[PDB]
Subunit: 106 residues, 2 copies
């Protein structure tokens, strides 16, 4: 199962509302997580089960599913949120990542 | 840039030597890292720059490169090593993962 993640990279400003998308090549139910990775660090879990926030993750993050299309939205981009984001499906094993989205300041 | 990881899954007993391979679709020098992921947890960094161990990673893990071929070796598999392992190239941005290798008991 492939996850088609887009955009690959984007530039945006503090305060912007921005959405990253991940299309599963087939039904993965709700077995999708999103992660954030900074250079030099391992990825951190942000969202699990498509739409549930991990503890500590701020409310400006949200996830949603509609069929095979998954989105991560940040409602007001903050300086800490500039990073690379990955979707992962873990419906089959081993799980598969999207190719990622680098979120850079404009 | 694609990292083709092999095999998708393998089974082995405690005390076995296990090797996992990642072939880069072009020369990426040494810009490859390896991660371990357990179910329910975010990936943990094991190896960076193809062959350097992160602090805290036991000596039984090693990484090597030959051209576009990257190998993770676990010299003597321990009960704490059953997990899914990913290579990741960071020659381009955003970095891209291989498809993963599930290492399972048997």
């Amino acid at each position: 199962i492939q996850m088609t993640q887009s955009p690959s990279s984007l530039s945006a400003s503090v305060g912007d509302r921005v959405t990253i998308t991940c299309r599963a090549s087939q039904d993965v139910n709700t077995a999708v997580a999103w992660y954030q990775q900074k250079p030099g660090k391992a990825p951190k879990l942000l969202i699990y089960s498509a739409s549930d926030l991990y503890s500590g993750v701020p409310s400006r993050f949200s996830g949603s599913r509609s069929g095979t299309d998954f989105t991560l939205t940040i409602s007001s981009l903050q300086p800490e949120d500039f990073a690379t984001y990955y979707c992962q499906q873990h419906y089959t094993t081993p799980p598969t990542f999207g190719q990622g989205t680098k979120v850079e300041i404009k």
